[PDB]
Design a protein around this ligand. Structure first.
Ligand code: 3DY
Ligand code: CA
Ligand code: CA
Ligand code: CA
Ligand code: CA
Lengths: 382, 385
C-alpha cells in the first residue's frame, strides 16, 4: 500500500502526490544519479592568456563553441585592449570604452588539450564606420556549413549603454578556421519592430545545425520596470547568410542570460543561467522550441562555449557535452573592469559516466556564509 | 518578421501563441518575474553570539534547531546539544562515552534571546531517558508545537549508536506547561514507521509540525532506497491531538526531494524549503492544500535544517504570512577528525510583510579563485585525457 522502499525506475501505478507524479513525468530519471542532464561543474584556470597584470586594459570573454580542425581545438572570443578600462557610456569616446565589451575585436586561440591555449591574434577586426560593428564586434559564435566557416557576432554601431546594450547581429566568413575573415556587412539577425521584446538587442548568437537547418538562438534585454528582463529566442535559416526567420513562439526560454545549447537525443538542451525564475537549470526541448526544466544545478558556467562535436553534423541523435570554455566577469575590481576566460568540465554527455560529477552540492565552512551578511540598512530594518 | 512578444512584460498571460516556456512562466509561478515572486529570496547569514564550542575541537556540537517561537517577552529555540570527552569516531569505535556520529550521545537543549542575534543558553529541555527507554542513547532533531496553551517537543530517540545494528530512532514527544519546562516524556508511539517494504519503514526524521486546517500537519523526512545511494523524500502525517498518534497522508511522499524538513503556512497553503538533495534541491515549493507541492522558485545558498520564526505556526491561520528569519546550522564546521556543527542565523524575504529588493538579487557571484577551488581530481584529469 505505502510508497515502496526501493525507488521504482518507472512510474508506479498508484495514486501519487503532485510532486511524486512530477518526479516521474517531468525528468529523464526519477533520481539525479541517472539524470543525463544533471551535473556539477568543475573549473580549471587556463594557461596562455596575458591580461596586462589585470589592470583592466585587457579583457577576454564570451567564448564561441570550441571546435576541432587541423588537429587542434579552436576558440574565438571578445578581445578588448584599451589604454583606459571601461568608463560607462557617458564618459566614453572614440578610444575610451563604455562597457567591458566596447571597442573590441574578435580574437582566437588554439590548443592541443583545452587547458593550455595559444593566442593567435585577430579574427574579426572592427569594420570602418558606419558599417554594422564599427564600434565593437563581440560575443561571437562559430558555424561550419558546407566546408566554410561563419562567425556570427554582435555588431555595435554606438557605445553600449548609449540607450541600452543595443545591437543587431552580423556575420563574417572564411574558408579556414585560421581566417582571414570576410565581413557580410549587412545585418543578419535583425532587431524586432517598435514595441517588440527584441527591438533593441540581439545578443549571444549561438547556431546549431538541426533538422537540416541552422537553428540560431539569441538573447534580448527587454522591459525595464522594475528591472530589465532577459529571455532567449530562436531564428532558423536554410543558408548561413539568411534569411533567418524568427520563431513565432519567441521567447523560447523564459530565463537565463547568455545562450548555450547543444543537440541532445532528438532534441536540444540549454544551459539557463543567472537570471529569471528558472535560473540555474539545464533545459530540454524535444523540438528545439518547447523547453522544459530538465535539472536544477549550481555554479553554472557563464557564457559557456562547449566543445560540441556534433554541432554541425546535422545529427539525428545528439550526444551532449562534457567540457568547454566560459568566463568570469569583473575579475578584479570595477575600476579595472575586465573578464577572463576559464575552462569548465561537466557530464552532460551520453558518452561520459562520472559519479564524481554528479554530487548534489558543494558546501563550505561557516566563514564563507558569513560573507553573505546583512547590510547596514537591512540590520537597521531589523 | 512574425509579430513579436511585447517589450513590456505583461503582468498576466497574454492572449497570443506562446512557447511552452513562456506559458509556464505565467501558469506555474506566483508572478512572471522574480521581483514580484513572494517565494523567491536570497539568504543572508549572521554569526550568532552566545554559544561556546570548546575552541571548536569537536567535543561540542549544536544542530537541527526547532522553529523559533516568542514566549514570555522573548525568543526561544531548542536544538541538538552534544558534549562528549571525544569527537565522533565512527560506528566501529563508539561506546558508552564515545559517540559514533555528530548527533550521538546528545540531548535537547534550549536558549533564549531578546533579538535573535545574541542567545542566552538555558541548558537541558529534554534529557536522555534511562535505558532501555526510547532515546536512552541520544535525543535529537526536535521541533516545537504550541497546542491549547501547552508546549510539545517532538524528537528522535535513538536506541543504539547511529551506524551500529539496532540504531532505530523513533519519534517521541515531551510536554510542558511552560517553554522553560520541566518536560515530561509521553512513552507512546507518535508517528509509526511505514510497514515493511515501504519508503518510511526505517526512519521518521526531522519532525516538523504546523497547525493547519484545524489539525497538526507534521512533515518529516525518510531515508530509503540505497542503490546506488540513499534517496530522501518528505512525508506528511496529521493528528487531532498533539500526543498523536499521527496518520500518514496516502499520497506520501509529498515532496520528491530535499533533506531536513522546513515549512510554513503561506496564503491558504503551505510553503517548504527543499534543500541539498533530490532533483528539486534548491527550491522553495508550495502546496495550496499542504499535500500537493509545486516548485515556487529556485534559490541558492539555502539554510540547512532551518528553524524559522513562524509567528503564525500555531494560530490556525486561514492566510499565512511567510517568514523572514530564523536559526539554521553548519555541519563539519572545522575538520572531520574534530567533527561538529554550529548554529547560525539566517535572514530572507519569504514574507507577505517584508519587501526588500536587496534580498532578491538573482545570484551571488565570486572571483575566479573561488571557482578554481572546485577543480578536477587527478582521476578525472586522467579520464578527460
Ligand atoms: O552584450 C552582452 C552579451 O555580450 C556582452 C554583453 O554581456 C554578455 O556576456 C552577453 O549577453
Ligand atoms: Ca556566447
Ligand atoms: Ca553522462
Ligand atoms: Ca528540524
Ligand atoms: Ca516579500
Amino acid at each position: 500500500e505505502g510508497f515502496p522502499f526501493i525507488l521504482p525506475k518507472e512510474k508506479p501505478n498508484r495514486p501519487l502526490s503532485a510532486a511524486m507524479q512530477r518526479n516521474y513525468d517531468n525528468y529523464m530519471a526519477p533520481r539525479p544519479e541517472n539524470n543525463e542532464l544533471y551535473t556539477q561543474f568543475k573549473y580549471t584556470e587556463l594557461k596562455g592568456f596575458d591580461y596586462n597584470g589585470h589592470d583592466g586594459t585587457i579583457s577576454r570573454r564570451d567564448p564561441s563553441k570550441v571546435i576541432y580542425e587541423n588537429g587542434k581545438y579552436y576558440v574565438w572570443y571578445t578581445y578588448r585592449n584599451t589604454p583606459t578600462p571601461p568608463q560607462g557610456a557617458k564618459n566614453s569616446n572614440d578610444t575610451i570604452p563604455s562597457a567591458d565589451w566596447d571597442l573590441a575585436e574578435i580574437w582566437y586561440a588554439t590548443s592541443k588539450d583545452g587547458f593550455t591555449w595559444e593566442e593567435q591574434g585577430v579574427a574579426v577586426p572592427r569594420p570602418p564606420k558606419p558599417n554594422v560593428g564599427w564600434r565593437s564586434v563581440t560575443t561571437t559564435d562559430i558555424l561550419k556549413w558546407k566546408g566554410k566557416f561563419y562567425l556570427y557576432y554582435q555588431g555595435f554601431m554606438e557605445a553600449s549603454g548609449t540607450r541600452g546594450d543595443d545591437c543587431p547581429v552580423a556575420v563574417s566568413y572564411a574558408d579556414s578556421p585560421d581566417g582571414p575573415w570576410t565581413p557580410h556587412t549587412e545585418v543578419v539577425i535583425p532587431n524586432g519592430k517598435k514595441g517588440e521584446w527584441d527591438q533593441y538587442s540581439i545578443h549571444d548568437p549561438y547556431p546549431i545545425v538541426y533538422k537540416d537547418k541552422i537553428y540560431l538562438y539569441y538573447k534580448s534585454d527587454f522591459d525595464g520596470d522594475p528591472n530589465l528582463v532577459r529571455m532567449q529566442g530562436l531564428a532558423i535559416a536554410d543558408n548561413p547568410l539568411g534569411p533567418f526567420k524568427k520563431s513565432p513562439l519567441n521567447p523560447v526560454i523564459n530565463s537565463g542570460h547568455e545562450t548555450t545549447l547543444f543537440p541532445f537525443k532528438e532534441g536540444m538542451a540549454a544551459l539557463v543561467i543567472r537570471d529569471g525564475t528558472e535560473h540555474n537549470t539545464v533545459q530540454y526541448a524535444e523540438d528545439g522550441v518547447n523547453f522544459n526544466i530538465a535539472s536544477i544545478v549550481e555554479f553554472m558556467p557563464n557564457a559557456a562555449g562547449p566543445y560540441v562535436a556534433d554541432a554541425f553534423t546535422n545529427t539525428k541523435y545528439g550526444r551532449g557535452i562534457s567540457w568547454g570554455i566560459s568566463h568570469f566577469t569583473n575579475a578584479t575590481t570595477w575600476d579595472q573592469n575586465h573578464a577572463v576566460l576559464a575552462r569548465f568540465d561537466c557530464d552532460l554527455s551520453l558518452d561520459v559516466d562520472d559519479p564524481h560529477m554528479k554530487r548534489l552540492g558543494t558546501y563550505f565552512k561557516p566563514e564563507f556564509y558569513y560573507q553573505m551578511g546583512l547590510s547596514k540598512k537591512q540590520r537597521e530594518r531589523i
